[PDB]
Homo-oligomer: A and B are copies of this chain.
């Protein structure tokens, strides 16, 4: 698994691959690891599939109820805090997951949350077995001044590098762009493929 989230001037970009290992072989080449959980909030999952899917359902319900009861979206930091409390409360019987939460309330934000409820904000982050390869790409090429279009190309290149070296990763790359003006926009695969050819990644 390889997931990544980066922050730009007024946008958040999140991306994953799609390979789901089960029964110690490549059973599903087209899984889903990136989810929209609020109007301007997204989430990526790594680890046990069953635990992660349950958490996604819980977060969608809680955020929706919050927005109805309080007339505003839950702030991104509060989303991370709520997740941190739930995970820590069962730390000795834990959800074995690693999560990324990203979105926009008044500024872009990306949060990394571990199985024990530790939550840390960062300018960019990556999870899964392919993450170390991603950090190498991000360390040498990431820039805060990048445009949205440059950022999308960057995450695509980072995940492509991970797929070449981490056997647990593979499949088509999914990308989401979150802005206040346009909201949560899932990039259609046709542009993802077009960028892949343009970047020379075959």
Contact = CB atoms under 8 A, between A and B. Distances in A.
A67 B161 CA distance: 41
**Chain copies in complex:** 10
Interface in A119-141: 119-120, 122, 125, 127, 131-137, 139-141
Interface in A84-114: 84-85, 87-88, 91-93, 98, 112, 114
Given A116-B50, A161-B139, A131 B88 contact: no
A118 B33 CA distance: 12
A135 B54 contact: no
A167 interface: yes
A154 to B, nearest CB: 10
A118 B88 CA distance: 22
21 contacts: A20-B118, A23-B131, A27-B120, A27-B122, A27-B135, A28-B112, A30-B122, A49-B118, A50-B84, A53-B84, A54-B84, A54-B85, A54-B117, A92-B93, A132-B132, A136-B158, A137-B137, A139-B165, A140-B157, A140-B158, A167-B170
